[PDB]
Design a protein around this ligand. Structure first.
Ligand SMILES: CN1C(=O)c2sccc2N(C)c2nc(Nc3ccc(S(N)(=O)=O)cc3)ncc21
Ligand SMILES: CN1C(=O)c2sccc2N(C)c2nc(Nc3ccc(S(N)(=O)=O)cc3)ncc21
Lengths: 279, 249
């Protein structure tokens, strides 16, 4: 028995665990055997091909009771959506600027490696205890190759999906940039645009509707609104890259990971008090 | 306004509290098998949804419990389909039971309306695992698209989850039109009548697919015992909910 499997993580099939020999904490995803095992292998391979501090690491796999268990890097503060849910508070512009700067470095790395995450959302941006954001959940990630310059699979989570992904015209890495723009709105408002309507109705509206904006635009700085606008350019050919968005005034002016300390402490404290009452 | 039962919250009368469409269709319906609109104030169903009952007890439903619930669900579908309405989101989560045990169709958020000029709808809408192949194919569809969703809901009540539940929704949507009709995971656990009922719901051709009126005459449905066989199911689910609420205090 290599791992001591502890509680289920988040607000789900990922569990916290301790490597008995080293004391090291890991996150282990329990794959239900009814999953398409060919998709699981593409996922694992994409994670193995990544060596970046801004991308969650894959450690290994094991079979137990017919299940495949995937051992991955554990990020102490949980996902951005978990932190929003635990504190019952949206994030400040400064907290968003800092998280999106680290998220953009992970996107820049992935896009250099010709990978499209295809599922960028606050739920897939994880923070370690020190406050560093990591791209996670490569379950739906796509790989561009010399023979495949564009992907065609209509996949992702509907509210965050780029118009060109839905249009079935072929798309590339900048589809993650549109998802990043929706994620910025989600971190500021608690939910993406169209969250209250059916996801299949959102699928139909996204290619025809003008780019989404903040629900109350007057509440946000000009740099934040312009950053969201640059992410949500409907033409993928004209859309800014992760490298270019790292130079946007909203991102360039991001304070260090130090400004996330209170955010992380308050969320972890809520989680600990919730666990203490369950005993 | 009391506790949440999502975005729905619980004279002495208990009630449950694009947007125009859900209300318009609900006002046009006057059936004991369809949730009523009061003024969004709606009819409160004591036992919650079928998925809530499965989740609370951590148990799937027996063939007899499914036969009884689907008989009342089919009467609601027969009423809607007579009124030229397509629910488009039939799943256990949208089948509600009152305290007595009567099933009601709920959540008309994505419901469609056929008219003299519009004999078929074209909107690709619903919840992917429950969506009919013709809805996904964009060829135009009618009321029997709810019958396919009902067949998936029968599998969902018996197994706890619809077929392809561990496949990505967006990948499942693309395969449904080319896949053969789904079956039970362990067919040997079920009677010839239940497996044939599911097979009649999951006929890929919508033109050949049985109507709600015809399925009310299927041996699996026709032989449904009264609402009395649901008493223990409802009492056990409500008891779990009450004990869960008591520990939260
Ligand atoms: C490996 N990994 C993942 O790929 C993803 S992607 C979406 C979710 C996950 N999960 C859940 C994870 N949770 C963690 N850490 C962690 C720590 C604390 C909490 S919390 N907020 O419940 O206290 C959640 C997750 N660390 C890493 C992951
Ligand atoms: C009006 N209405 C609805 O349209 C729908 S459609 C999908 C959900 C709803 N909701 C939640 C409702 N919950 C109820 N009753 C109710 C009673 C008990 C419980 S439980 N299982 O949490 O104890 C849930 C809902 N009664 C009615 C509804």
């Amino acid at each position: 028995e290599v791992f001591d499997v502890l509680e289920k993580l988040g607000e789900g099939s990922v569990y916290k665990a301790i490597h008995k020999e080293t004391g090291q904490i890991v996150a282990i995803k329990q794959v239900p055997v009814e999953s398409d095992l060919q998709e699981i292998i593409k996922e694992i391979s994409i994670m193995q091909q990544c060596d970046s501090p801004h991308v969650v690491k894959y450690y290994g796999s094991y079979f137990k009771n017919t299940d495949l268990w995937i051992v991955m890097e554990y990020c102490g503060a949980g996902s951005v959506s978990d932190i929003i849910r635990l504190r019952n508070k949206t994030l400040t512009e400064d907290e968003i600027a800092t998280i999106l700067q680290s998220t953009l470095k992970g996107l820049e790395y992935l896009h250099f490696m010709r990978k499209i995450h295809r599922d960028i959302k606050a739920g897939n941006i994880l923070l370690n205890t020190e406050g560093h954001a990591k791209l996670a959940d490569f379950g739906v990630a796509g790989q561009l190759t010399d023979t495949m310059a564009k992907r065609n699979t209509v996949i992702g989570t509907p509210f965050w999906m780029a118009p060109e992904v839905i249009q079935e015209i072929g798309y590339n890495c900048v589809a993650d940039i549109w998802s990043l723009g929706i994620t910025a709105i989600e971190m500021a408002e608690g939910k993406p645009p169209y969250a209250d309507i059916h996801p299949m109705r959102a699928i139909f509206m996204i290619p025809t509707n003008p780019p989404p904006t903040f629900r109350k635009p007057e509440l946000w700085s000009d740099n934040f609104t312009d950053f969201v606008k640059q992410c949500l350019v409907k033409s993928p050919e004209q859309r800014a890259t992760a490298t270019q968005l790292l130079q946007h005034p909203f991102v360039r002016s991001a304070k260090g990971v130090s400004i996330l300390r209170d955010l992380i402490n308050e969320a972890m404290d809520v989680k600990l008090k919730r666990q203490e009452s369950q005993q």
